[PDB]
């Protein structure tokens, strides 16, 4: 309680709630829209780009590994993202200065696992999925 409970206090309630909703964390990203503007995506699930150069990222402690990322610039916003390559040895199935299709990690703007600075992964290298390259259901077209 600690609040008015008149029968004519609809205004003082409905204007108060509309204000104290802005302090909520979820709401403040959704409704200012600065989230979208800042994102390298337009708010689309995927996006398409062109590879710039392979890189390797050294994982945050205590784990030690090299995580074989790429760096890609996008078509639809012309700006750059550092993107993970999943499975094993799929670095080889990516070849520089071609198109790729990117996709978010699965934690909505926040780095996943022990790798820092990488919020994206890669799905298609030339209309052929990393899954099908790895399994052998399709082959890289050269």
């Amino acid at each position: 309680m600690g609040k008015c409970r008149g029968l004519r206090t609809a205004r003082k309630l409905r204007s108060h709630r509309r204000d104290q909703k802005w302090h909520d964390k979820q709401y403040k990203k959704a409704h200012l829209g600065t989230a979208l503007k800042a994102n390298p995506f337009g708010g689309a699930s995927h996006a398409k780009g062109i590879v710039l150069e392979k890189v390797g990222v050294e994982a945050k402690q205590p784990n030690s590994a090299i995580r074989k990322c790429v760096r890609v610039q996008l078509i639809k916003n012309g700006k750059k993202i550092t993107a993970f390559v999943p499975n094993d040895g799929c670095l080889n199935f990516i070849e520089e200065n071609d198109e790729v299709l990117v996709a978010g990690f699965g934690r909505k703007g926040h780095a996943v696992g022990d790798i820092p600075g990488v919020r994206f992964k890669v799905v298609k290298v030339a209309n052929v999925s990393l899954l099908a390259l790895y399994k052998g259901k399709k082959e890289r077209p050269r």
Partner: protein, 59 residues
């Protein structure tokens, strides 16, 4: 060895044994797949004292 192109991919898949042993069998589907699942778990009659043994085990 920790080393041996330890800055580069392929080191646990390109140097394993290659196995391609497989069976020939016809597995059941739909109705019959549930029929075997029902009988094999619950009615044979199943019970044996103090059993705890799971549906798999290497015991």
């Amino acid at each position: 060895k920790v080393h041996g192109s330890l800055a580069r991919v392929g080191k646990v898949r390109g140097q394993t044994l290659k196995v391609a042993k497989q069976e020939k069998k016809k597995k059941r589907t739909g109705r019959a797949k549930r029929r075997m699942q029902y009988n094999r778990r619950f009615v044979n009659v199943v019970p044996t004292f103090g059993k705890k043994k799971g549906p798999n085990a290497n015991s």
